[PDB]
Amino acid sequence: GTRVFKKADPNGKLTVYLGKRDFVDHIDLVDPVDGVVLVDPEYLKERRVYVTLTCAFRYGREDLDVLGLTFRKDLFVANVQSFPPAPKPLTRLQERLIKKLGEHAYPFTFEIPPNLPCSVTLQPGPEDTGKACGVDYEVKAFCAENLEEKIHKRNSVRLVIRKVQYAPERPGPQPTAETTRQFLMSDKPLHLEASLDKEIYYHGEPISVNVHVTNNTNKTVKKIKISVRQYADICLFNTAQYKCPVAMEEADDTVAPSSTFCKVYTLDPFLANNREKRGLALDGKLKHEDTNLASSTLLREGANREILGIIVSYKVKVKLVVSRSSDVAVELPFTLMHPKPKDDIVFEDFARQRL
Ligand SMILES: [Ba+2]
Ligand SMILES: [Ba+2]
Ligand SMILES: [Ba+2]
Q1: How many angstroms separate the CA atoms of 291 and 102, rounded?
Q2: Of 23, 88, 202, 345, most Cβ neighbours within 10 A?
Q3: Of the residues 121, 153, 169, which one is the last residue of a structural domain?
Q4: Quick one: which of 5, 79, 9, 11 has its CA closest to 36?
């Protein structure tokens, strides 16, 4: 049908409506945040209702929002006055919501700038609980007389939407191969060559690595280890670098001396196989089902890397275990993106599904 999400304040006087939880960041544009807020005039005797979208990097324990212990930096703020409206054309969905809700439904629309970072959440673990961080997008509606006075938290409604990063695939040639040649007490080297089928992968999509080994030595490769590793750099409040494997396959395959090897391995770097690992960047909260691995950060040409709170990157690693025991290895970069999203109105709680 036509799904619409809604959340109200504890008093039941202010309810926000949204057509989707996740808004897709295409490179050039991002989905508009078109919404409607239902007000109660008896509660708004003299006051107005504002809706503010805030993109903020946070640092510190997740369950705490207090001065001194929790750091936050606003990366983008936008304010609209939903009542009085004082009108930008409206969307089809907004017209339907006002048509159904009545005379006290008022619209609001945000246009997220493209260069802003996407929703990301780093879960550091039980040992270092204070190093948690991330950036979030919050839609907040509240009743006030202006944007300067202090507002009670339960007089307002907060909806943590996500911006997710999508990118189309490139029509150019296939990704280039990475090579390495190393000598292992040998007159001639061991040649390792790996490559990826695609450049841009999506969540839940497997990755095929093409491994090609030319062993011109007298040594024997005992094992072939293939893995996808996540790299995540914290750039705003406490500079840090994280290394975490999100997929692993130990192949017992053996490359003989003076022989040539070739094989295509496939691994599944899915969050469903990392529910116990920590120090890992996610695109949302570890509790929700719609949470996946953090998408690759799109670093634009000569762009401010610092105002993006966390930089996330992925690489496939291919390691050869030579018998003796040295190691020959190569890494392959790839981009992890969010999948393309592919009448009466039915309401539903905005709260994302747990477990
Ligand atoms: Ba009336
Ligand atoms: Ba190289
Ligand atoms: Ba497999």
Answers
A1: 35
A2: 23
A3: 169
A4: 5
Q: Do 183 and 64 have their domain in common?
A: no
137 and 183 within one domain: no
Coil, helix or strand for 154? helix
Beta-strand pair 33-38/120-123? unpaired
DSSP, collapsed to helix, strand or coil, labels residue 199 as coil
Instruction: Spell out the residues 6+ positions from residue 288 whose beta carbon is closer than 8 angstroms to its own.
Output: 352, 353, 354
Is 153 within 8 Å of 141 (Cβ atoms)?
no
β 15-18/2-8 pair status:
antiparallel
Dihedral angle computed from the Cα positions of residues 125, 128, 130 and 131, in that order, rounded to the nearest 10 degrees = -80
User: Which string of b and e fits 45-75 if b means at least 16 CB within 10 Å?
Assistant: eebbbbbbbbbbbbbbebeeeeeeeeeeeeb
CA of residue 84 relative to chain centroid, distance: 36
Q: Which residues are annotated as a binding site for 1D-myo-inositol hexakisphosphate?
A: 243, 248, 317, 319
Give 178 Cα–ligand 2 centroid separation in angstroms. Answer: 5
Q: Report how this structure was experimentally obtained.
A: X-ray
**Same structural domain for residues 128 and 252?**
no
Ligand lying closest to the C-alpha of residue 103: 1
104 Cα to the center of ligand 1, angstroms:
9
